Amino acid sequence: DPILTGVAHDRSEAKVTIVGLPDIPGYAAKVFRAVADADVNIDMVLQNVSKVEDGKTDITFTCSRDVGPAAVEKLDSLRNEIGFSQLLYDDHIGKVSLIGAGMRSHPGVTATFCEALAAVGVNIELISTSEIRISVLCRDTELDKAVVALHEAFGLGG
Amino acid sequence: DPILTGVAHDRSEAKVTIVGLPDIPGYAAKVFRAVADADVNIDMVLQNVSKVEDGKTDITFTCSRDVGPAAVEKLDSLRNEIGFSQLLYDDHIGKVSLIGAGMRSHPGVTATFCEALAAVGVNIELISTSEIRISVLCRDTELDKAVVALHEAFGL
Amino acid sequence: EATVYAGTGRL
Ligand SMILES: C[C@@H](O)[C@H](N)C(=O)O
Numbered sequence: 369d370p371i372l373t374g375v376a377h378d379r380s381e382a383k384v385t386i387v388g389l390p391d392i393p394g395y396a397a398k399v400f401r402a403v404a405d406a407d408v409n410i411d412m413v414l415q416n417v418s419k420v421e422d423g424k425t426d427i428t429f430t431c432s433r434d435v436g437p438a439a440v441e442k443l444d445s446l447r448n449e450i451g452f453s454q455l456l457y458d459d460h461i462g463k464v465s466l467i468g469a470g471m472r473s474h475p476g477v478t479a480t481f482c483e484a485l486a487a488v489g490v491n492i493e494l495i496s497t498s499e500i501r502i503s504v505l506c507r508d509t510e511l512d513k514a515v516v517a518l519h520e521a522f523g524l525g526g
Numbered sequence: 527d528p529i530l531t532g533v534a535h536d537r538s539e540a541k542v543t544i545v546g547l548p549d550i551p552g553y554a555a556k557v558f559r560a561v562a563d564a565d566v567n568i569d570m571v572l573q574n575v576s577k578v579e580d581g582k583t584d585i586t587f588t589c590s591r592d593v594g595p596a597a598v599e600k601l602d603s604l605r606n607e608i609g610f611s612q613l614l615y616d617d618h619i620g621k622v623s624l625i626g627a628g629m630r631s632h633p634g635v636t637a638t639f640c641e642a643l644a645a646v647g648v649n650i651e652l653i654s655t656s657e658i659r660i661s662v663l664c665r666d667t668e669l670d671k672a673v674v675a676l677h678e679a680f681g682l
Numbered sequence: 683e684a685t686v687y688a689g690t691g692r693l
């Protein structure tokens with residue numbers, strides 16, 4: 369059985385998405401070096417695959433709401449060096465995570481997590497998981513009900 | 527500063543991508559219940575944001591190459607219910623990871639990781655990170671050189 | 683739309 373230890377939540381973050389980056393070597397390097405140069409600490413980093421139709425993908429990261437605009441302006445100032453097509457910024461996200469161990473051999477845990485949020489009408493914006501954590505972002509105004517649903521689904525937070 | 531303990535590599539996985547999933551509640555649930563019903567263990571799940579232009583996004587997960595086909599077959603059988611447009615399956619991936627702790631206070635680490643791979647011409651197909659790991663997928667034939675590059679870049 | 687078997691660099 370999986371060991372599930374807690375549900376954590378954070379409403380202190382913003383999401384920055386670099387849209388339309390060529391899926392070619394060196395492009396993620398330019399994005400992250402720009403963010404490092406701006407001295408912006410980054411929490412979640414996510415990039416899914418490109419498809420043949422445009423040969424591009426997006427990179428998202430989260431950071432504190434306080435420094436989000438500095439990250440955006442740094443990237444924008446290098447938009448032609450880097451070659452992305454647009455930046456998206458969302459300072460109204462909540463992050464919620466199920467924390468535990470041994471989840472790889474239990475895909476029902478990931479199913480349950482998503483089913484719990486669905487049951488209360490919470491839209492899942494972004495997902496990043498591992499064998500020790502399932503994390504999602506949702507609208508910050510939906511965070512509370514997400515947390516409660518997860519407490520109930522996993523028998524946590526008593 | 528951060529601590530970096532090693533570089534991990536894995537050539538045993540495949541990636542399944544559910545393309546064009548509706549970005550409304552309940553759809554990730556349908557995907558993952560299907561995968562769980564198929565008895566397919568999941569290593570990593572990644573879903574980035576929809577863009578407003580289509581109100582859809584993709585979900586990728588990795589699993590062992592031995593069970594990928596069962597996952598594809600199961601999802602394919604639920605195309606109407608789940609409402610995706612396409613499945614992509616890639617069983618030629620390598621997973622390479624930088625292992626450590628305390629990386630969130632050091633954005634230079636993620637940059638260096640990507641610079642190390644770029645400099646040897648490894649394309650980063652997918653990225654997922656945590657407090658303790660930066661993981662990417664690349665072509666399996668690029669895996670060895672990615673490993674060597676990270677070893678050198680981080681003194682590991 | 684048919685499943686794409688990717689990664690092979692082939693038809
Ligand atoms: C999109 C970005 O990850 C690119 N594939 C790179 O390797 O830099």
Ligand SMILES: C[C@@H](O)[C@H](N)C(=O)O
Binds near residue numbers: 490491492494554583
């Ligand atoms: C795309 C998928 O994550 C959807 N937003 C859901 O909540 O199920």
